[PDB]
Design a binder for this molecule. Structure first.
Ligand SMILES: NC(=O)N1CCC(CC(=O)N2CCC([C@H]3c4ncc(Br)cc4CCc4cc(Cl)cc(Br)c43)CC2)CC1
Ligand SMILES: CC(C)=CCC/C(C)=C/CC/C(C)=C/COP(=O)(O)OP(=O)(O)O
Ligand SMILES: [Zn+2]
Lengths: 401, 315
């Protein structure tokens, strides 16, 4: 275990004897993480890195049916709860009874707007975040019933209603614009095969403007580089086949710099704290960058590993991000939620599975029962679900109007 | 008559006489609900009533006051926010009193997309940015890195052209925490949108300033990323004195950031046909292994990639 090595103690923060809110909060975190790493030593047992599948499963299968009122704050993100859960069950290799699947379908049908796209719950105006989640969930289910839920003609119509002259998209009518909308739109449009010749005109150029001096991408041009926005920007470009619109090298340096030398997990932006959900948003960028550089015929790329420490990330997730009661989390001391369960699991899968053309190479830390189902780095649903969905929607012609 | 959602004498809408005429519309979750939230009595009450007035598009003062309660129960409900803006224009509400409202709610929950977007809509309508820099500064005093706060700030400044005192505010926050990457980002936003970095005096002032910060806190990555960011533009090799000046901190201020910056300067020297191609390359490759095996092992895969890549390129 890389984290438990003696020389690893050398990776602790060095504040130069100049304390600020930043160095103080980081130190608090490193302190709490160290107690976790050393827990084995102090209790004299052999470290057994085990992914509590059964614990995660009861939590998941239960949240899929009902939730306490603590979730009232996510009452406008219900299609997200469906995606987060079904996708977590999918990574864990747990099946969706055909009865559960049809129920989820019927629910998303209620969330779908007569104007296209899905709202955060039955009767809510459509928004791109829950539209992306609703579409991804239906693709994980992959039945003809699920696929048929989506009104492709109203969907394309909705996307056009959000499209802006500068290339960006609003998140919803009368709403805000940021890189998330570009990804949400490129994701649902590509999966459903509704991309017209001009739908994304100028979009690649607008996303390119979000890349700043740090190498990463901000929510809108001018903003600080962040992992959630950077994944959205790059993943959208990959879908549009415009990855080259970005300085891929400065981005590679930025994302690789986001992995915490000590904790092993990824921070969202420079000088902030590590967080389990970034095991996906940030680490998810490495597979995307591998593909892009490889497309450019990069000869120096690895043939077995992603350009981040797959071992350290898996150790941070397995040792620090699991709630004993089931569910995963941001960091030790945080409460579990379905969002972090989904992304901690998504990031673990990315960390375990390498692949570039004919090469395949796994790295499963802890017990081998830890290995999860692979996840497509662009859509974050099973690669099989992507192929199955796109192949299906390709039988339909692009809506003409 | 704003009966607070938190007031000890708050009564459910179904127990309110001035609402006894309207029937609450319950949520249609389907016969076999999924990810079904067990709402509290209050939440359920307010929303069943919100659905009712929305479904009938009742643009009343009573509907307006109710959206405030529905917003307070779930500030992320964008449908409610939309209808609230609908009623703000219908009832012709005093938008300044609404600015007072949004100021409070943002203070309560500053990490919410809806509240900041709403504030921006109000500022646009009133074409009045006069309270902005000060309001935002109060939020940044509570969380100096709030993403929405910095985003709103960039919007007000660019939209209304309020550039004049921002670099000073940046210097202020940098004194408070020289590691606040949001402030380093703001520094670049201001400079690139005012003077720019082609003005040699500015560039000099910026590189000198940054180097002083590096000297003070050598392990502060933000100052390093900013240094790289403002020179990387024209090409690090374009600055012959820099390598030397950094090589000097090799014993005193030598974090793995100094090491990584040297490899960056070398990478650009090679691509830019430098003297001693064989030599320079060996130094760069040497540093990549020191980094991969010793100084920055978390990024070993990256540094090996850099090593291999440099070889293929400049053998
Ligand atoms: N401890 C508790 O009581 N609970 C546990 C936590 C839970 C909220 C949650 O899971 N949350 C809180 C809300 C988060 C939400 C979001 N919301 C507002 C802002 Br500003 C930023 C982000 C960023 C995270 C992100 C990412 C995606 Cl893809 C999708 C969503 Br919808 C989000 C999701 C996780 C409620 C219940
Ligand atoms: C498709 C889709 C909807 C993707 C979502 C991407 C994502 C997670 C974006 C982050 C948004 C944000 C404002 C983060 C800063 O919060 P923070 O200051 O609380 O956390 P931080 O300190 O780690 O940056
Ligand atoms: Zn998180």
């Amino acid at each position: 275990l890389y984290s438990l090595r003696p020389e690893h103690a050398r990776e602790r923060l060095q504040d130069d004897s100049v304390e600020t809110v930043t160095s103080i909060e980081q130190a608090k975190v490193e302190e709490k993480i160290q107690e976790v790493f050393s827990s084995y030593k102090f209790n004299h047992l052999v470290p057994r890195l085990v992914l509590q599948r059964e614990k995660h499963f009861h939590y998941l299968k239960r949240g899929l049916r009902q939730l306490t009122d603590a979730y009232e704050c996510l009452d406008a993100s219900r299609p997200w709860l469906c995606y987060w859960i079904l996708h977590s069950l999918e990574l864990l290799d747990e099946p969706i009874p055909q009865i559960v699947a049809t129920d989820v379908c019927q629910f998303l049908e209620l969330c779908q707007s007569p104007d296209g796209g899905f709202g955060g719950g039955p009767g809510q105006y459509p928004h791109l975040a829950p539209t992306y989640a609703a579409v991804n969930a239906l693709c994980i289910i992959g039945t003809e019933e699920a696929y048929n839920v989506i009104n492709r003609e109203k969907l394309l119509q909705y996307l056009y209603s959000l499209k802006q002259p500068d290339g960006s998209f609003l998140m919803h009518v009368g709403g805000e614009v940021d890189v998330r909308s570009a990804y949400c739109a490129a994701s649902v449009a590509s999966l459903t095969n509704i991309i017209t010749p001009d739908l994304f005109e100028g979009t690649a150029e607008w996303i390119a403007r979000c890349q700043n001096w740090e190498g990463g991408i901000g929510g809108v041009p001018g903003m600080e580089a962040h992992g959630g926005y950077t994944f959205c920007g790059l993943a959208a470009l990959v879908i549009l086949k415009k990855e080259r619109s970005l300085n891929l090298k400065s981005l590679l340096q930025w994302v690789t710099s986001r992995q915490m030398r000590f904790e092993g997990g990824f921070q969202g932006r420079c000088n902030k704290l590590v967080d389990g959900c970034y095991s996906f948003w940030q680490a998810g960028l490495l597979p995307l960058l591998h593909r892009a550089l490889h497309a450019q015929g990069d000869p120096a790329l690895s043939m077995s590993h992603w350009m981040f420490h797959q071992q350290a990330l898996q150790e941070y997730i397995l040792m620090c991000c699991q709630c004993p009661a089931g569910g995963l989390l941001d960091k030790p001391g945080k409460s579990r939620d379905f969002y972090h369960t989904c992304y901690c699991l998504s990031g673990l899968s990315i960390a375990q599975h390498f692949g570039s053309g004919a090469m395949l190479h796994d790295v499963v830390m802890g017990v081998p029962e830890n290995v999860l189902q692979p996840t497509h780095p662009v859509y974050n649903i099973g690669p099989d679900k992507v192929i199955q969905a796109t192949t299906h929607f390709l039988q339909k012609p692009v809506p003409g109007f | 008559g704003f009966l607070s959602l938190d007031s000890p004498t708050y009564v459910l809408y179904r127990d309110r006489a001035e609402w006894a005429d309207i029937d609450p519309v319950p949520q249609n979750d389907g016969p076999s609900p999924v990810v079904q939230i067990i709402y509290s009595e209050k939440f359920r009450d307010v929303y069943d009533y919100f659905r009712a007035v929305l479904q009938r598009d009742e643009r009343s003062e009573r509907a307006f006051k109710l959206t405030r309660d529905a917003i307070e129960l779930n500030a992320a409900n964008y449908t409610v926010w939309h209808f609230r803006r609908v009623l703000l224009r219908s009832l012709q509400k005093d938008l300044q009193e609404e600015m007072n409202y949004i100021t409070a709610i943002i203070e309560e929950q500053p990490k919410n997309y809806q509240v900041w977007h709403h504030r921006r809509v109000l500022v646009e309508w009133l074409k009045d940015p006069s309270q902005e820099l000060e309001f935002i500064a109060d939020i940044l005093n509570q969380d100096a890195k709030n993403y929405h706060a910095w985003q709103h700030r960039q919007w007000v400044i660019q939209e209304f052209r309020l550039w004049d005192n921002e670099l000073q505010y940046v210097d202020q926050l940098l004194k408070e925490d020289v590691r606040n990457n949001s402030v380093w980002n703001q520094r670049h936003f201001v400079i690139s949108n005012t003077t720019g970095y082609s003005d040699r005096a500015v560039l000099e002032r910026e590189v000198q300033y940054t180097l002083e910060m590096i000297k003070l806190v050598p392990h502060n990555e933000s100052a390093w990323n900013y240094l790289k960011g403002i020179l990387q533009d024209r090409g690090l090799s374009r600055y012959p004195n820099l390598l030397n000046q950094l090589l000097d901190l090799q014993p005193s201020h030598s974090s793995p950031y100094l090491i990584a910056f040297l490899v960056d300067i070398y990478e650009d020297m090679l691509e830019n046909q430098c003297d001693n191609k064989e030599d320079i390359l060996n130094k760069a490759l040497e540093l990549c292994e020191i980094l991969a095996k010793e100084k920055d092992t978390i990024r070993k895969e990256y540094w090996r990639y850099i090593g291999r890549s440099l070889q293929s390129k400049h053998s």
